Write a protein that holds these residues in place. Structure first.
Motif, PDB file in Angstrom:
ATOM      1  N   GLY A   1      82.162  -3.364  68.108  1.00 46.75           N
ATOM      2  CA  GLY A   1      82.625  -3.797  69.412  1.00 46.75           C
ATOM      3  C   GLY A   1      81.706  -3.257  70.483  1.00 46.75           C
ATOM      4  O   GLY A   1      80.727  -2.560  70.196  1.00 46.75           O
ATOM      5  N   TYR A   2      82.017  -3.587  71.731  1.00 46.99           N
ATOM      6  CA  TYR A   2      81.149  -3.179  72.833  1.00 46.99           C
ATOM      7  C   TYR A   2      81.403  -1.736  73.252  1.00 46.99           C
ATOM      8  O   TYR A   2      82.548  -1.261  73.299  1.00 46.99           O
ATOM      9  CB  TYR A   2      81.347  -4.098  74.032  1.00 46.99           C
ATOM     10  CG  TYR A   2      80.715  -5.445  73.801  1.00 46.99           C
ATOM     11  CD1 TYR A   2      79.362  -5.612  74.004  1.00 46.99           C
ATOM     12  CD2 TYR A   2      81.438  -6.531  73.334  1.00 46.99           C
ATOM     13  CE1 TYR A   2      78.740  -6.815  73.813  1.00 46.99           C
ATOM     14  CE2 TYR A   2      80.819  -7.758  73.128  1.00 46.99           C
ATOM     15  CZ  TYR A   2      79.469  -7.887  73.364  1.00 46.99           C
ATOM     16  OH  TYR A   2      78.837  -9.088  73.156  1.00 46.99           O
ATOM     17  N   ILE A   3      80.307  -1.064  73.603  1.00 44.55           N
ATOM     18  CA  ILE A   3      80.347   0.281  74.158  1.00 44.55           C
ATOM     19  C   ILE A   3      79.436   0.331  75.376  1.00 44.55           C
ATOM     20  O   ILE A   3      78.430  -0.394  75.457  1.00 44.55           O
ATOM     21  CB  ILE A   3      79.939   1.356  73.138  1.00 44.55           C
ATOM     22  CG1 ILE A   3      78.467   1.231  72.681  1.00 44.55           C
ATOM     23  CG2 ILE A   3      80.893   1.326  71.949  1.00 44.55           C
ATOM     24  CD1 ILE A   3      78.018   2.376  71.813  1.00 44.55           C
ATOM     25  N   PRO A   4      79.746   1.188  76.347  1.00 44.85           N
ATOM     26  CA  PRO A   4      78.843   1.354  77.497  1.00 44.85           C
ATOM     27  C   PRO A   4      77.622   2.153  77.055  1.00 44.85           C
ATOM     28  O   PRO A   4      77.745   3.258  76.543  1.00 44.85           O
ATOM     29  CB  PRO A   4      79.706   2.099  78.522  1.00 44.85           C
ATOM     30  CG  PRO A   4      80.806   2.725  77.736  1.00 44.85           C
ATOM     31  CD  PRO A   4      80.951   2.038  76.440  1.00 44.85           C
ATOM     32  N   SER A   5      76.423   1.596  77.261  1.00 43.49           N
ATOM     33  CA  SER A   5      75.236   2.222  76.683  1.00 43.49           C
ATOM     34  C   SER A   5      74.911   3.575  77.303  1.00 43.49           C
ATOM     35  O   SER A   5      74.244   4.391  76.654  1.00 43.49           O
ATOM     36  CB  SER A   5      74.019   1.313  76.788  1.00 43.49           C
ATOM     37  OG  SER A   5      73.715   1.038  78.131  1.00 43.49           O
ATOM     38  N   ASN A   6      75.364   3.836  78.531  1.00 46.65           N
ATOM     39  CA  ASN A   6      75.110   5.147  79.124  1.00 46.65           C
ATOM     40  C   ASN A   6      76.001   6.239  78.530  1.00 46.65           C
ATOM     41  O   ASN A   6      75.830   7.419  78.866  1.00 46.65           O
ATOM     42  CB  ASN A   6      75.214   5.115  80.652  1.00 46.65           C
ATOM     43  CG  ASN A   6      76.625   4.902  81.140  1.00 46.65           C
ATOM     44  OD1 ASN A   6      77.344   4.020  80.662  1.00 46.65           O
ATOM     45  ND2 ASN A   6      77.040   5.725  82.087  1.00 46.65           N
TER      46      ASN A   6
ATOM     47  N   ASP B   1      87.514  -6.409  73.434  1.00 44.07           N
ATOM     48  CA  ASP B   1      86.269  -6.419  72.676  1.00 44.07           C
ATOM     49  C   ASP B   1      85.498  -5.109  72.703  1.00 44.07           C
ATOM     50  O   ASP B   1      84.459  -5.025  72.032  1.00 44.07           O
ATOM     51  CB  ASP B   1      85.378  -7.574  73.132  1.00 44.07           C
ATOM     52  CG  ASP B   1      85.935  -8.913  72.719  1.00 44.07           C
ATOM     53  OD1 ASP B   1      86.972  -8.925  72.016  1.00 44.07           O
ATOM     54  OD2 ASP B   1      85.343  -9.948  73.079  1.00 44.07           O
ATOM     55  N   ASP B   2      85.974  -4.099  73.435  1.00 37.81           N
ATOM     56  CA  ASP B   2      85.314  -2.805  73.478  1.00 37.81           C
ATOM     57  C   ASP B   2      85.971  -1.831  72.498  1.00 37.81           C
ATOM     58  O   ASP B   2      87.070  -2.061  72.001  1.00 37.81           O
ATOM     59  CB  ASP B   2      85.192  -2.237  74.901  1.00 37.81           C
ATOM     60  CG  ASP B   2      86.485  -2.042  75.594  1.00 37.81           C
ATOM     61  OD1 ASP B   2      86.447  -1.406  76.675  1.00 37.81           O
ATOM     62  OD2 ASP B   2      87.516  -2.521  75.094  1.00 37.81           O
TER      63      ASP B   2
ATOM     64  N   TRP C   1      76.113  -3.118  78.217  1.00 40.47           N
ATOM     65  CA  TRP C   1      77.137  -3.006  77.193  1.00 40.47           C
ATOM     66  C   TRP C   1      76.517  -3.458  75.883  1.00 40.47           C
ATOM     67  O   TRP C   1      76.016  -4.590  75.774  1.00 40.47           O
ATOM     68  CB  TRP C   1      78.343  -3.872  77.529  1.00 40.47           C
ATOM     69  CG  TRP C   1      79.131  -3.341  78.680  1.00 40.47           C
ATOM     70  CD1 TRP C   1      78.897  -3.569  80.001  1.00 40.47           C
ATOM     71  CD2 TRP C   1      80.269  -2.471  78.613  1.00 40.47           C
ATOM     72  NE1 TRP C   1      79.822  -2.904  80.760  1.00 40.47           N
ATOM     73  CE2 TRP C   1      80.676  -2.223  79.934  1.00 40.47           C
ATOM     74  CE3 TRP C   1      80.990  -1.889  77.568  1.00 40.47           C
ATOM     75  CZ2 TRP C   1      81.770  -1.417  80.240  1.00 40.47           C
ATOM     76  CZ3 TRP C   1      82.084  -1.088  77.877  1.00 40.47           C
ATOM     77  CH2 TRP C   1      82.454  -0.855  79.202  1.00 40.47           C
ATOM     78  N   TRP C   2      76.550  -2.585  74.896  1.00 38.20           N
ATOM     79  CA  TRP C   2      75.922  -2.838  73.615  1.00 38.20           C
ATOM     80  C   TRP C   2      76.979  -3.104  72.565  1.00 38.20           C
ATOM     81  O   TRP C   2      78.031  -2.461  72.547  1.00 38.20           O
ATOM     82  CB  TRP C   2      75.127  -1.617  73.154  1.00 38.20           C
ATOM     83  CG  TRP C   2      73.916  -1.257  73.954  1.00 38.20           C
ATOM     84  CD1 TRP C   2      73.362  -1.917  75.007  1.00 38.20           C
ATOM     85  CD2 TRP C   2      73.093  -0.109  73.707  1.00 38.20           C
ATOM     86  NE1 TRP C   2      72.224  -1.231  75.427  1.00 38.20           N
ATOM     87  CE2 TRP C   2      72.037  -0.130  74.630  1.00 38.20           C
ATOM     88  CE3 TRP C   2      73.157   0.931  72.776  1.00 38.20           C
ATOM     89  CZ2 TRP C   2      71.057   0.873  74.663  1.00 38.20           C
ATOM     90  CZ3 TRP C   2      72.197   1.914  72.805  1.00 38.20           C
ATOM     91  CH2 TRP C   2      71.171   1.884  73.738  1.00 38.20           C
ATOM     92  N   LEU C   3      76.659  -3.983  71.644  1.00 38.51           N
ATOM     93  CA  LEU C   3      77.504  -4.217  70.490  1.00 38.51           C
ATOM     94  C   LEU C   3      77.156  -3.189  69.423  1.00 38.51           C
ATOM     95  O   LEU C   3      76.020  -3.154  68.937  1.00 38.51           O
ATOM     96  CB  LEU C   3      77.221  -5.636  70.027  1.00 38.51           C
ATOM     97  CG  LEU C   3      78.165  -6.173  68.993  1.00 38.51           C
ATOM     98  CD1 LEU C   3      79.607  -6.136  69.461  1.00 38.51           C
ATOM     99  CD2 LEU C   3      77.752  -7.593  68.679  1.00 38.51           C
TER     100      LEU C   3
ATOM    101  N   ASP D   1      83.816  10.998  75.702  1.00 44.05           N
ATOM    102  CA  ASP D   1      84.911  10.152  75.253  1.00 44.05           C
ATOM    103  C   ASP D   1      84.957   8.853  76.054  1.00 44.05           C
ATOM    104  O   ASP D   1      84.563   8.817  77.226  1.00 44.05           O
ATOM    105  CB  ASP D   1      86.260  10.861  75.485  1.00 44.05           C
ATOM    106  CG  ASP D   1      86.441  12.158  74.702  1.00 44.05           C
ATOM    107  OD1 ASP D   1      85.932  12.286  73.574  1.00 44.05           O
ATOM    108  OD2 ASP D   1      87.171  13.034  75.232  1.00 44.05           O
ATOM    109  N   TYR D   2      85.514   7.796  75.449  1.00 42.83           N
ATOM    110  CA  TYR D   2      85.719   6.538  76.150  1.00 42.83           C
ATOM    111  C   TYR D   2      86.952   5.850  75.589  1.00 42.83           C
ATOM    112  O   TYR D   2      87.092   5.718  74.369  1.00 42.83           O
ATOM    113  CB  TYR D   2      84.492   5.614  75.965  1.00 42.83           C
ATOM    114  CG  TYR D   2      84.663   4.251  76.559  1.00 42.83           C
ATOM    115  CD1 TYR D   2      84.568   4.045  77.911  1.00 42.83           C
ATOM    116  CD2 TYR D   2      84.932   3.145  75.741  1.00 42.83           C
ATOM    117  CE1 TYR D   2      84.759   2.781  78.445  1.00 42.83           C
ATOM    118  CE2 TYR D   2      85.127   1.895  76.265  1.00 42.83           C
ATOM    119  CZ  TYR D   2      85.043   1.721  77.614  1.00 42.83           C
ATOM    120  OH  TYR D   2      85.234   0.483  78.184  1.00 42.83           O
TER     121      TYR D   2
END
Length: 59
Positions: free
Chosen positions: A48-53, A16-17, A36-38, A9-10
């Motif tokens: 929107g942006y998400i943490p790629s890990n 923008d995330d 951070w990936w779009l 979960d995040y």
């Protein structure tokens, strides 16, 4: 395309995330600008942006 699935979960912290749940799937829009990936959620239709890990490629 290679889809990605959330490992954890995040909760969004910025404008923008994206917030997402473990198991949510994404189509990646851009991943050439750092960790951070779009991304585009297949659940909500938001981009929107998400943490790629926090994601893994789907087999």
């Amino acid at each position: 395309v290679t889809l990605f699935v959330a490992l954890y979960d995040y909760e969004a912290r910025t404008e923008d995330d994206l917030s997402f749940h473990k198991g949510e799937k994404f189509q990646i829009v851009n991943n050439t600008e750092g960790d951070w990936w779009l991304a585009h959620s297949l659940t909500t239709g938001e981009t929107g942006y998400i943490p790629s890990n926090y994601v893994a490629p789907v087999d």
